[PDB]
Amino acid sequence: DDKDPMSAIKPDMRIKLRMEGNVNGHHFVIDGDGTGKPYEGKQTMDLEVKEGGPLPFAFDILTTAF
Amino acid sequence: NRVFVKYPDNIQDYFKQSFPKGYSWERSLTFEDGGICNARNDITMEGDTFYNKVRFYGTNFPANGPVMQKKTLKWEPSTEKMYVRDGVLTGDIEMALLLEGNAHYRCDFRTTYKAKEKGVKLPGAHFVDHAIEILSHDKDYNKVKLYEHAVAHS
After folding, report:
1. Whether the Cβ atoms of residue B72 and residue B31 lie closer than 8 Å to each other
2. For chain B, what are the domain ranges?
3. What is the interface size between A and B, counted as CB pairs within 8 Å?
4. B1-154: what CATH class?
5. Which structural domain, as residue segments, surrounds residue A60?
6. Which ranges form a coiled coil (chain A) (predicted)?
7. How far is the C-alpha of B120 from the C-alpha of A64, rounded, in Å?
8. Can you give the CATH number for the domain in which A2 is found?
9. Do B52 and A32 touch (CB under 8 A)?
10. Dihedral of alpha carbons B92, B93, B94, B95, sign
């Protein structure tokens, strides 16, 4: 094939994120800024709670949803 | 975001083939004590940046349980099984949270993945190994640095 295999997905890409929701009635907004290497299967993100903090529940339950 | 997976050449990469338009996923988390979460992400791409619109709703967590009491330590590395279920790419996984006091708290995940573009070829059944970890955090988790590694096989 003649197509650029990485026309869309580049070796080094950035990430932006906003999460909204609530756990047991406790509402929150969390922002994220990160980077990753798609073909290496790696990503890193800096998360910051913007509303509802300090969260009254385990942060770990959120992490696979970023 | 499963675009961040090392796919070998002999497995179809649904996630990278979903771009530039993007894809979405819908997930159920069901915990051993009745806690239940529903999560979803709409993933688009503009230039070199993936944008994520995430929603997370959790209920039925017991007040005395490890989630509301903040007794968790980390997720254990695990393997997601990818397969076509009623025509939709589906991932199932049994995950476990390490707790304080030499204990684990188990959770079943089902996720469906949908390419925004019609005609993105569904992959054959395979597996994705991953590990997720918090590298650093504030005392109250107002700020958290997160890292994940994932590889597809079989």
Report:
1. no
2. 1-154
3. 156
4. mainly beta
5. 1-65
6. none
7. 25
8. 3.30.1300.40
9. yes
10. negative
